[PDB]
Amino acid sequence: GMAALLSQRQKRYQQFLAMKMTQVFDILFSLTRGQPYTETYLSSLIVDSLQDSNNPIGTKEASEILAGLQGILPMDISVHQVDGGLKVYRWNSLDKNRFSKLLQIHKSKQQD
Questions:
Q1: Number of Cβ atoms within 10 Å of the Cβ of 2
Q2: Which end of the chain has fewer CB atoms at under 10 Å, N or C?
Q3: What's the burial of 57, exposed, middle or buried (CB within 10 Å: 0-12/13-18/19+)?
């Protein structure tokens, strides 16, 4: 019924988001590390890199995914705002294998 419909769509979205977060990580990994990047640049880059007709991703989604990734990797990725303004991200070394493990753990805690 309705509860099943809500449940099923939510589960598909959980999978989608986790997939997208791993691609966002791949995108950050491809950039020159150790310099600031604005949220605006990174979110447009995520959308431009991953979007197609059949796999929509919007600016707001990309921004939240990026924020989630920093939240999971706070020891690797920093985020700063001046007076609640534009978010600016920085990182040095990133490790995908650690990230992949942390993602599954965080997904479990949230229940995906």
A1: 6
A2: N
A3: buried
Work out the angle at residue 72's Cα, subtended by the Cα atoms of residues 23 and 29, and round it to the nearest 5 degrees: 35
Backbone torsions φ then ψ of 100, nearest 5 degrees:
-55, -40
Secondary structure of the chain in HEC code, one letter for each residue: CHHHHHHHHHHHHHHHHHHHHHHHHHHHHHCCCCCCEEHHHHHHHHHHHHCCCCCCCCHHHHHHHHHHHHHHCCCCEEEECCCCCCCEEEECCCCHHHHHHHHHHHHHHHCC
CA distance 111 to 17: 13
Beta bridge partners of 78: 90
- Which residue range(s) make up the domain with 25? 1-112
List the determination method.
X-ray
User: Which residues on neighbouring strands pair with residue 91, listed in sequence order?
Assistant: 77
Please tell me the total number of residues recorded for the chain in this structure.
Answer: 112
